[PDB]
Amino acid sequence: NNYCDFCLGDSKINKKTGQPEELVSCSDCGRSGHPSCLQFTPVMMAAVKTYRWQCIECKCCNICGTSENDDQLLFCDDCDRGYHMYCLTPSMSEPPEGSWSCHLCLDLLKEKASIYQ
Ligand SMILES: [Zn+2]
Ligand SMILES: [Zn+2]
Ligand SMILES: [Zn+2]
Ligand SMILES: [Zn+2]
């Protein structure tokens, strides 16, 4: 929990970059990483600190709260939250093309959301 799974560093030292960098930790299993190690964009690096982020193994739909039907569980390209295609309104029959930003991110980030330009 107090070490980055990817570089084995900690909050005091990112071993890849040499800089101090906060860890983000999965709210369910404790899997931790530096945001840069997790290869998050600066927008996502920021977003995962504003809510109880979950790693891919633990990720649940933010709407229904389940981790079932992973073949329909979208990840927002800005905040990394999961959403089932069928939980969205309107429901999506097929996955989207290109980048996809959830409603929370569109509201908060506006023009900085991935879906734009
Ligand atoms: Zn790291
Ligand atoms: Zn986890
Ligand atoms: Zn759902
Ligand atoms: Zn989002």
Give the single-character DSSP code of 92: P
| Cα 96 to middle of ligand 2, angstroms | 25
Q: Helix or strand or coil: residue 45? A: helix
Torsion angle of C-alpha atoms 3, 59, 39, 10, degrees rounded to 10 = -10
Resolution of this deposited model, Å: 1.6
Nearest residue to 34 (alpha-carbon basis) of 11, 55, 18, 54: 11
The tokens for 34 are 């530096």
Instruction: For the chain, report the end-to-end CA distance as a whole number of angstroms.
Output: 37
Cα 58 from Cα 39, distance rounded (Å): 18
Nearest CA among 36, 7, 8 for reference residue 21: 36
C-alpha 105 – ligand 4 centre gap (Å): 4
CA–CA gap between residue 104 and residue 16 (Å, rounded): 32
Q: Which residue, chain included where needed, has tokens 């649940």?
A: 60
CATH level 3 topology of 1-117 = Herpes Virus-1 (3.30.40)
Instruction: Specify the 3-state DSSP secondary structure of 18.
Output: coil
Identify the experimental approach.
X-ray
Placement of tokens 């389940």 in the chain: 66
Distance 43 CA to ligand 1 centre (A): 18
The ligand placed nearest to the CA atom of residue 38 is: 1
CB 44 within 8 A of CB 50: no
